[PDB]
């Protein structure tokens, strides 16, 4: 549509199961922003340390809006505590089914 | 294992973007008859013509590499060879919302 798909590659340093903790309340902040559409986290099969973010907003105001959220900043803190990130934006060119 | 497997791939395209993108449309096409395709999504980023995500999902490990090992991928594999560059990793879902 008009939306935009966050990524996120995360490099895990610590303990996964902290990161994934710190991660779902990151997750549950964003799920009640106006424009969000869904989320994904995934985990690198043959690796203990790396992992994925997908972020789906409606369009890029939507998302930032998101970001420049006050409440938004100790959860970033906390992930980079925790991981070296490389991240972008994105369009959807090709969707299937659809 | 039993899992459901997201796939992910990177690409730099070096050839013309569009000849690129109509190539993977074929490639999903051909995908999207193999068994236990869940889903595919090609993504560009934003002010780049030339970096490109796709996110294919499985329903579990074999049925990917199925899809992956059938004479009818080589054709495709082989048109995006000549185009682009790449690096892939196998993803499993944790979360969702
Ligand atoms: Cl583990
Ligand atoms: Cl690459």
Same mark, same amino acid.
């Given at each position: 549509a008009d939306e935009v798909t966050f990524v996120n590659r995360f490099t895990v340093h610590g303990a996964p199961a902290e990161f994934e903790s710190v991660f779902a309340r990151t997750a549950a902040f964003f799920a009640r922003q106006p424009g969000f559409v869904r989320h994904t986290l995934l #985990?690198? #099969?043959d690796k203990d340390?790396?992992? +994925?973010?997908?972020? +789906?907003?409606?369009?890029?105001?939507?998302?930032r #809006?998101? &970001?420049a959220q006050p409440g938004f900043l100790p959860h970033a803190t906390a992930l #980079?505590? &925790?991981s070296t990130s490389e991240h972008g934006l994105f369009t959807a060119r090709q969707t299937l089914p659809e």
């Open positions: #985990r690198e #099969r340390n790396s992992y +994925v973010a997908i972020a +789906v907003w409606t369009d890029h105001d939507a998302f #809006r998101a &970001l #980079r505590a &925790l």
